[PDB]
Amino acid sequence: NKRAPYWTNTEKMEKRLHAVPAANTVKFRCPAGGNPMPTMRWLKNGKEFKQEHRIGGYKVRNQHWSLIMESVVPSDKGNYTCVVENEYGSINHTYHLDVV
Numbered sequence: 892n893k894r895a896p897y898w899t900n901t902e903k904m905e906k907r908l909h910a911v912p913a914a915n916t917v918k919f920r921c922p923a924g925g926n927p928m929p930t931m932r933w934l935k936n937g938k939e940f941k942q943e944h945r946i947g948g949y950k951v952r953n954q955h956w957s958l959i960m961e962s963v964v965p966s967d968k969g970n971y972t973c974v975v976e977n978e979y980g981s982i983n984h985t986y987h988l989d990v991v
Contacts, residue, residue: 895980896925921973
């Protein structure tokens with residue numbers, strides 16, 4: 892019973908536009924399921940998002956399908972996309988961040 896990825900709690904993904912004041916913490920989530928367990932990765936404005944891309948780097952919490960960025964700064968604005976994959980499929984969702 893192998894299966895493509897799918898989102899398990901779309902309610903937490905409803906709100907796509909987030910305006911947050913510098914230097915708060917932002918936490919984005921893409922709760923998913925599938926079999927085998929899909930891997931998760933994040934892109935910032937369509938390109939692979941790596942630790943070395945912002946001073947504070949970020950924490951990815953695998954069991955929670957979440958991306959966490961502490962003390963956001965203006966250069967943190969942009970589109971954040973989670974890409975969830977296994978051999979039976981690849982799915983994505985994009986959040987937009989505005990640092991006030």
